[PDB]
Structure 1
Amino acid sequence: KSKELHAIKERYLKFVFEWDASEDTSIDYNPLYKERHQVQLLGRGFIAGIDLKQ
Protein backbone atom coordinates (compact mmCIF):
# COMPACT_ATOMS: atom_id res chain seq x y z
CA LYS A 1 0.00 0.00 0.00
CA SER A 2 2.57 2.60 1.10
CA LYS A 3 5.22 1.28 -1.26
CA GLU A 4 2.45 1.12 -3.86
CA LEU A 5 1.76 4.84 -3.51
CA HIS A 6 5.47 5.67 -3.35
CA ALA A 7 6.10 3.80 -6.60
CA ILE A 8 3.19 5.65 -8.21
CA LYS A 9 4.55 9.01 -7.04
CA GLU A 10 8.09 8.21 -8.18
CA ARG A 11 6.90 7.09 -11.62
CA TYR A 12 4.69 10.14 -12.19
CA LEU A 13 6.88 12.80 -10.54
CA LYS A 14 39.47 -1.81 -4.43
CA PHE A 15 39.08 -5.31 -5.89
CA VAL A 16 35.49 -6.37 -5.17
CA PHE A 17 35.46 -10.10 -5.84
CA GLU A 18 31.86 -10.55 -4.67
CA TRP A 19 28.98 -8.59 -6.18
CA ASP A 20 27.46 -5.86 -4.04
CA ALA A 21 24.01 -6.86 -2.79
CA SER A 22 22.80 -3.34 -3.62
CA GLU A 23 22.76 -4.42 -7.28
CA ASP A 24 19.99 -6.94 -6.57
CA THR A 25 16.65 -6.71 -8.36
CA SER A 26 13.28 -8.40 -7.62
CA ILE A 27 12.83 -6.31 -4.43
CA ASP A 28 9.23 -5.67 -5.43
CA TYR A 29 6.08 -4.60 -3.57
CA ASN A 30 3.35 -6.36 -5.56
CA PRO A 31 2.67 -9.77 -3.94
CA LEU A 32 2.00 -11.25 -7.39
CA TYR A 33 5.60 -10.48 -8.42
CA LYS A 34 7.09 -11.92 -5.21
CA GLU A 35 5.07 -15.07 -4.47
CA ARG A 36 5.07 -16.35 -8.03
CA HIS A 37 3.08 -19.53 -8.56
CA GLN A 38 5.54 -22.36 -9.15
CA VAL A 39 5.18 -24.52 -12.25
CA GLN A 40 4.20 -28.07 -11.33
CA LEU A 41 4.65 -29.57 -14.83
CA LEU A 42 1.69 -31.91 -14.25
CA GLY A 43 3.60 -33.25 -11.25
CA ARG A 44 5.90 -35.19 -13.57
CA GLY A 45 8.46 -32.64 -14.78
CA PHE A 46 11.21 -31.42 -12.47
CA ILE A 47 13.72 -28.59 -12.32
CA ALA A 48 17.29 -29.40 -13.32
CA GLY A 49 20.02 -29.79 -10.71
CA ILE A 50 18.02 -29.89 -7.48
CA ASP A 51 17.67 -33.29 -5.79
CA LEU A 52 14.68 -35.24 -7.10
CA LYS A 53 13.49 -36.48 -3.70
CA GLN A 54 13.27 -32.88 -2.46
Structure 2
Amino acid sequence: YLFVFEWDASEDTSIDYNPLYKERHQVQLLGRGFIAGIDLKQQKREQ
Protein backbone atom coordinates (compact mmCIF):
# COMPACT_ATOMS: atom_id res chain seq x y z
CA TYR A 1 0.00 0.00 0.00
CA LEU A 2 2.93 2.44 0.30
CA PHE A 3 31.98 -16.18 -15.98
CA VAL A 4 29.20 -17.41 -13.68
CA PHE A 5 27.85 -20.68 -15.10
CA GLU A 6 25.54 -21.36 -12.15
CA TRP A 7 22.33 -19.54 -11.32
CA ASP A 8 22.31 -17.50 -8.12
CA ALA A 9 19.91 -18.24 -5.26
CA SER A 10 18.73 -14.60 -5.37
CA GLU A 11 17.10 -15.32 -8.76
CA ASP A 12 14.67 -17.75 -7.09
CA THR A 13 10.90 -17.22 -6.91
CA SER A 14 8.19 -18.91 -4.71
CA ILE A 15 9.89 -17.67 -1.52
CA ASP A 16 6.48 -16.95 -0.01
CA TYR A 17 5.63 -17.28 3.67
CA ASN A 18 2.10 -18.64 3.15
CA PRO A 19 0.72 -21.79 4.80
CA LEU A 20 -1.38 -22.40 1.68
CA TYR A 21 1.46 -22.13 -0.86
CA LYS A 22 4.42 -23.90 0.75
CA GLU A 23 2.25 -26.99 1.29
CA ARG A 24 0.50 -26.78 -2.07
CA HIS A 25 -1.23 -30.20 -1.55
CA GLN A 26 -0.47 -31.96 -4.85
CA VAL A 27 -2.99 -34.40 -6.31
CA GLN A 28 -2.73 -38.20 -6.48
CA LEU A 29 -5.66 -38.60 -8.93
CA LEU A 30 -7.93 -41.38 -7.58
CA GLY A 31 -4.90 -43.49 -6.65
CA ARG A 32 -4.53 -44.29 -10.35
CA GLY A 33 -2.64 -41.40 -11.91
CA PHE A 34 1.13 -41.31 -11.65
CA ILE A 35 3.71 -38.57 -12.00
CA ALA A 36 5.89 -39.44 -14.98
CA GLY A 37 9.46 -40.65 -14.59
CA ILE A 38 9.59 -40.72 -10.81
CA ASP A 39 9.70 -44.37 -9.73
CA LEU A 40 6.30 -46.06 -9.53
CA LYS A 41 7.07 -48.13 -6.43
CA GLN A 42 8.42 -44.99 -4.75
CA GLN A 43 5.24 -43.14 -5.76
CA LYS A 44 3.16 -45.94 -4.25
CA ARG A 45 5.22 -45.58 -1.06
CA GLU A 46 4.86 -41.79 -0.79
CA GLN A 47 1.09 -41.72 -1.38
Q: Work out whether the TM-score is over 0.5.
A: yes
More helix by share: 1
Within a 5 Å distance, the mapping from 1:1-54 to structure 2 comes to 12-13=1-2, 15-52=3-40
Q: Percent identity?
A: 98
Query: How far does the alpha carbon of each residue in 1:1-54 deviate from its partner, in whole angstroms, 9 at most, with x for none?
Result: xxxxxxxxxxx11x1111001100111011101101110111110101111198
Moved over 4 A (4+): none
Q: TM-score of the superposition, structure 1-length normalised?
A: 0.68
Q: Which has the larger Rg?
A: 1
Q: Which has the higher contact order (CA 8 A, sep 6+)?
A: 1
Unaligned 5+ segments in structure 1 are 1-11
